[PDB]
Amino acid sequence: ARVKRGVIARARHKKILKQAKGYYGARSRVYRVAFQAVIKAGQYAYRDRRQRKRQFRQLWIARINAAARQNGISYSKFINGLKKASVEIDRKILADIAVFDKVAFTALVEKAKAALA
Amino acid sequence: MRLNTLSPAEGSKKAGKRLGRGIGSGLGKTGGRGHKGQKSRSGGGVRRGFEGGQMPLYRRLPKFGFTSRKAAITAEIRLSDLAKVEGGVVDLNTLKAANIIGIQIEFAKVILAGEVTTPVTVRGLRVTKGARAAIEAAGGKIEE
Amino acid sequence: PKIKTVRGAAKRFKKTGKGGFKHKHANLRHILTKKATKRKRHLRPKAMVSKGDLGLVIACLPYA
Amino acid sequence: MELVLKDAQSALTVSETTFGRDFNEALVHQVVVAYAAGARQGTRAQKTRAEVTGSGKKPWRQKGTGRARSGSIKSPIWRSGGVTFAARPQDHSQKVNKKMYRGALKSILSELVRQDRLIVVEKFSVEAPKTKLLAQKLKDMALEDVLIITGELDENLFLAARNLHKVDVRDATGIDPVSLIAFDKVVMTADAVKQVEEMLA
RNA sequence: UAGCGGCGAGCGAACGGGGAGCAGCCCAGAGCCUGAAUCAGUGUGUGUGUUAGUGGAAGCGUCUGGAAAGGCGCGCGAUACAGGGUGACAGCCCCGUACACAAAAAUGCACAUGCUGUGAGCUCGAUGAGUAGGGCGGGACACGUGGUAUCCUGUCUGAAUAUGGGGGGACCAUCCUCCAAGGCUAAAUACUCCUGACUGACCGAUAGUGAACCAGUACCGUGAGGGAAAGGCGAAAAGAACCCCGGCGAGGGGAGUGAAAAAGAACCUGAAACCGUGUACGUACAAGCAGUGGGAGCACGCUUAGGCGUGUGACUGCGUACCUUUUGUAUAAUGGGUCAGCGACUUAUAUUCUGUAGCAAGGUUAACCGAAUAGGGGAGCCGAAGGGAAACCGAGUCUUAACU
Ligand SMILES: [Mg+2]
Ligand SMILES: [Mg+2]
Ligand SMILES: [Mg+2]
Ligand SMILES: [Mg+2]
Ligand SMILES: [Mg+2]
Ligand SMILES: [Mg+2]
Ligand SMILES: [Mg+2]
Ligand SMILES: [Mg+2]
Ligand SMILES: [Mg+2]
Ligand SMILES: [Mg+2]
Ligand SMILES: [Mg+2]
Ligand SMILES: [Mg+2]
Ligand SMILES: [Mg+2]
Ligand SMILES: [Mg+2]
Ligand SMILES: [Mg+2]
Ligand SMILES: [Mg+2]
Ligand SMILES: [Mg+2]
Ligand SMILES: [Mg+2]
Ligand SMILES: [Mg+2]
Ligand SMILES: [Mg+2]
Ligand SMILES: [Mg+2]
Ligand SMILES: [Mg+2]
Ligand SMILES: [Mg+2]
Ligand SMILES: [Mg+2]
Ligand SMILES: [Mg+2]
Ligand SMILES: [Mg+2]
Ligand SMILES: [Mg+2]
Ligand SMILES: [Mg+2]
Ligand SMILES: [Mg+2]
Ligand SMILES: [Mg+2]
Ligand SMILES: [Mg+2]
Ligand SMILES: [Mg+2]
Ligand SMILES: [Mg+2]
């Protein structure tokens, strides 16, 4: 029962090199190198599904801050104000409104100010 | 029931280990041998009883006894054996014929093991105190 | 082929009814005058092989 | 229990422990796997590094050349080298406990009955060693893929059956586990039953 | 196992039991009867094997296709459906196969018979001496000089004679058993350079022989010796007439053959590394494992819009490869130029445990027989009894005079 490995091995290498498309040089041509590239790609990707949630929140905050300061209050007090007003709109939505409905954002600032006054 | 609808009892054909076939298997690389040293090597390992150099237990301790050539031609008979002989007479020959003692046995003892529920005539055999009580209770006879 | 008995083990251990091994005590061969009578008395009777050593003895006596 | 004769419209009295017991599949499996293994010839070999042709000369000095150290031109690492765990003729047969053998047969016969694959008749023979006659008889009986088991060897029947691929003929003494399974129907003469019964105590 | 054993590592019987096979003779001598059984060499006969061979059943229509053995229809042979070949997969086209047959000649083996030679049965004898034994040194016996019987003998010695002698594991007695120092003998047993037939959960061109091929070659070496690489057009060569560029080239473009030249001789399939031509997108103010997360723009498809697929990726957050070895490696420690193929926990027998199955105080047979994976074979082995060094006692036993 002698077993030849070509068909199985070829499918295995091809499955990796296909995931390496777009990579530079040996990384998209040469199995040994492609394999290490695909692994590192998964590692980073795992890492960055966690990081992605960090970077976006960091973006929202920064924009809320800008829009808050435009209406004369700082991010930190604005958040405290809204918390004391039992407003529960989160930061993704608040950052959207900061950009697309400047009049509603101002109204949110007045609700924050009132709750702090 | 066809040659392609028969299968073995659950758990009766466990699969063999195959070392050295990668990370997923759990037995890759070192193959469960750990790292380095004598035991990791092909053909590596120490002999039975070896303890590292210390005088081992089977040399530490002293020899005792001798072997009795007589014990080996001496057999014990159970009460449960007495009915298994054709003729209700138990001798060395009878017991040999019924395959109860070895062909070269020259002495035998009936002991209190199992039971006897039929009258038997034991003869040319030693009989234990208990066995004599049991053999006689069932109507049997002992004689030299 | 058949496993071979470590024959020197077979001259020092005997299997008992429940599967352990009996053996003779060390220290009662010579240099006896200095040894207390009490001490020597307690070395006369046979003793049982300890838990730590059964693996070793059993390995040496596959046909015990 | 009683087996209805196909066309005698008569009954035959058989041992319930033989023809009437539960299917022990694990038991049957072990015996048919053992039978198939017992049919293996086991004849082959390959060459170890010791048996490959060539000499024991070290292909190059141990140190200094920059090549991986080598020792034998027949190393199994090497093209043209020995096979690391080269094969030898082996005997693949297995022991089957006598009682496990008979038990397996009993279970088989009992499923055949239970699956209506067992057919009993008074006689089964042909008038001449002509394949055409057997074929004809089989058509008339609505049989095609079938094991015929008779009491004593029947020569005509044996010869007439040989070129029929879906048909095998067998005297009661020579039955086997995989034949009892491998055909759609099994036809047995009364005598064959009486003999198999005696055989399975 | 009993034993041997720096009683270490190891070495390892025999008695007895089950089987295969079975076969018993001659000389050490003269007489009487005498060619009387036997063997061999060998003529002849028949028998029968081998070395060439002979016969050997039964299918046609239709569809697809370059081709039919394939599909579909309806037939037929089969003691032959083992296998192979034929333009794709054939019981019925071919070769075979089942079965039935055959030798002028040489040869094997067998009974029969002639022959040269060998001697049969009978009576009365005879009965293996530098031998057995022994001292010394070694060797062989499972047995290593041990308390060491038995065997062989290099050296020195040296008996008895059936009223005798050997052995029974130091040695002695008793008893039992056998008869050395002369020889022959078939079967059961071991093997395969070779011949024929058949088979394989053996390989299928880096495998299987070193060798599928003009291989023990080419090649290396003074020599012994070492020792490769290297299979596939197509069904059929129908292997490309003829024309054109070119050196009466290499190479190519047509034509033609073919089902196909997406088979053209470097010829089935035709992967990967590696190298090109073409298009889309990016790229010449920009610093690092080259990706990943966010993301404009362009190109290309959508959906008929919907802020979606695909490719690209300005800009931006994070981010020092893998293996190995280590307390610890981006490590300036190891290993890998890349790809493809190969490359490492097996196998046999013992042993124990787990899982599973059978039978259960029983379970199971081995060699072998065989009606051959059945059935026979229970010789054995493990288990239902232990304790004691042992004798021995025994559900107990040992310890001790005896155990609270
Ligand atoms: Mg690519
Ligand atoms: Mg990382
Ligand atoms: Mg295994
Ligand atoms: Mg290592
Ligand atoms: Mg270490
Ligand atoms: Mg270790
Ligand atoms: Mg027995
Ligand atoms: Mg002492
Ligand atoms: Mg090879
Ligand atoms: Mg059997
Ligand atoms: Mg041996
Ligand atoms: Mg014998
Ligand atoms: Mg015989
Ligand atoms: Mg023909
Ligand atoms: Mg074709
Ligand atoms: Mg003599
Ligand atoms: Mg002698
Ligand atoms: Mg001594
Ligand atoms: Mg003689
Ligand atoms: Mg041959
Ligand atoms: Mg080759
Ligand atoms: Mg190939
Ligand atoms: Mg040309
Ligand atoms: Mg054409
Ligand atoms: Mg062309
Ligand atoms: Mg090609
Ligand atoms: Mg620029
Ligand atoms: Mg740079
Ligand atoms: Mg260090
Ligand atoms: Mg680090
Ligand atoms: Mg490095
Ligand atoms: Mg390097
Ligand atoms: Mg590779």
UniProtKB/Swiss-Prot annotation, chain A:
An annotated GO cellular component: cytosolic large ribosomal subunit
GO terms for MF: large ribosomal subunit rRNA binding; mRNA binding; mRNA regulatory element binding translation repressor activity; structural constituent of ribosome
Keyword list, A-Z: Ribonucleoprotein, Ribosomal protein, RNA-binding, rRNA-binding
A GO BP annotation: cytoplasmic translation
Keyword rRNA-binding: yes
InterPro entries: Ribosomal_bL20, RIBOSOMAL_L20_CS, Ribosomal_protein_bL20_C
Gene3D superfamilies: 6.10.160.10, Ribosomal protein L20 (1.10.1900.20)
Statement: the UniProt record of this protein carries the keyword ATP-binding: no
Matching SUPFAM superfamilies: Ribosomal protein L20
Record-stated family: Belongs to the bacterial ribosomal protein bL20 family.
PANTHER family linked to this entry: 39S RIBOSOMAL PROTEIN L20
Protein purpose: One of the primary rRNA binding proteins, it binds close to the 5'-end of the 23S rRNA. It is important during the early stages of 50S assembly.
Complex formation: Part of the 50S ribosomal subunit. Contacts L21.
Descriptive protein name: Large ribosomal subunit protein bL20
Species name: Escherichia coli (strain K12)
The encoding gene: rplT
UniProtKB/Swiss-Prot annotation, chain B:
Keywords for the protein's UniProt record, in alphabetical order: Ribonucleoprotein, Ribosomal protein, RNA-binding, rRNA-binding
GO cellular component, one term: cytoplasm
Entry annotated with the keyword Ribosomal protein: yes
Region (Disordered): 1-54
Gene3D superfamilies assigned: 3.100.10.10
Ranges annotated as biased composition (Gly residues): 21-31
Any Pfam family the entry gives: Ribosomal_L27A
Top-level lineage group: Bacteria
BP-aspect Gene Ontology terms: cytoplasmic translation
GO molecular function annotations of the record: rRNA binding; structural constituent of ribosome
The keyword Ribonucleoprotein appears for this protein: yes
Assembly and oligomerization: Part of the 50S ribosomal subunit. Contacts the 5S rRNA.
Protein function: This protein binds the 5S rRNA. It is required for the late stages of subunit assembly, and is essential for 5S rRNA assembly onto the ribosome.
Family under the similarity heading: Belongs to the universal ribosomal protein uL15 family.
PANTHER family: 50S RIBOSOMAL PROTEIN L15, LARGE RIBOSOMAL SUBUNIT PROTEIN UL15M
Name of the molecule in the record: Large ribosomal subunit protein uL15
Organism in which the protein naturally occurs: Escherichia coli (strain K12)
Gene that encodes it: rplO
Swiss-Prot record, chain C:
A molecular-function term among this protein's GO annotations: structural constituent of ribosome
Region annotated Disordered, chain positions: 1-21
Biased composition (Basic residues): 9-21
Keyword Cell membrane recorded: no
Xref: SUPFAM superfamilies: L35p-like
Gene Ontology CC terms: cytoplasm; cytosolic large ribosomal subunit
GO biological process, alphabetically ordered: cytoplasmic translation
Protein's name in the database: Large ribosomal subunit protein bL35
Organism phylogeny: Bacteria, Pseudomonadati, Pseudomonadota, Gammaproteobacteria, Enterobacterales
Sequence similarity: Belongs to the bacterial ribosomal protein bL35 family.
Residue ranges of the TM segments: none
NCBIfam families according to UniProt: rpmI_bact
Known partners and oligomeric status: Part of the 50S ribosomal subunit.
Organism: Escherichia coli (strain K12)
The keyword Ligase is assigned to this record: no
Any Pfam family: Ribosomal_L35p
This protein's UniProt keywords: Ribonucleoprotein, Ribosomal protein
Curated annotation (Swiss-Prot), chain D:
Biological process, per Gene Ontology: cytoplasmic translation; DNA-templated transcription termination; negative regulation of cytoplasmic translation; negative regulation of DNA-templated transcription; negative regulation of translation; response to antibiotic; ribosome assembly; transcriptional attenuation
Chain residue ranges for the region called Disordered: 44-71
Key words, A-Z: Antibiotic resistance, Repressor, Ribonucleoprotein, Ribosomal protein, RNA-binding, rRNA-binding, Transcription, Transcription regulation, Transcription termination, Translation regulation
SUPFAM superfamilies assigned to the protein according to its UniProt record, in alphabetical order: Ribosomal protein L4
Consequence when changing T131I: Does not regulate the S10 operon; assembles into ribosomes in vivo
Pfam families according to UniProt: Ribosomal_L4 (PF00573)
Regions crossing the membrane: none
Resulting phenotype, K63E: In strain: N282; confers erythromycin resistance. Ribosomes bind erythromycin poorly and have reduced peptidyltransferase activity
Recorded superkingdom: Bacteria
Single GO term (MF): mRNA 5'-UTR binding
GO CC annotation terms, alphabetical: cytoplasm; cytosol; cytosolic large ribosomal subunit; large ribosomal subunit
Outcome, altering L134P: Does not regulate the S10 operon in vivo
Note: The erythromycin sensitive allele is dominant over the resistant allele.
PANTHER family membership: 50S RIBOSOMAL PROTEIN L4 (PTHR10746), LARGE RIBOSOMAL SUBUNIT PROTEIN UL4M (PTHR10746:SF6)
Subunit structure: Part of the 50S ribosomal subunit. In TnaC-stalled ribosomes forms part of the binding pocket for L-Trp with the leader peptide and uL22.
HAMAP family: Ribosomal_uL4_B (MF_01328_B)
Family note: Belongs to the universal ribosomal protein uL4 family.
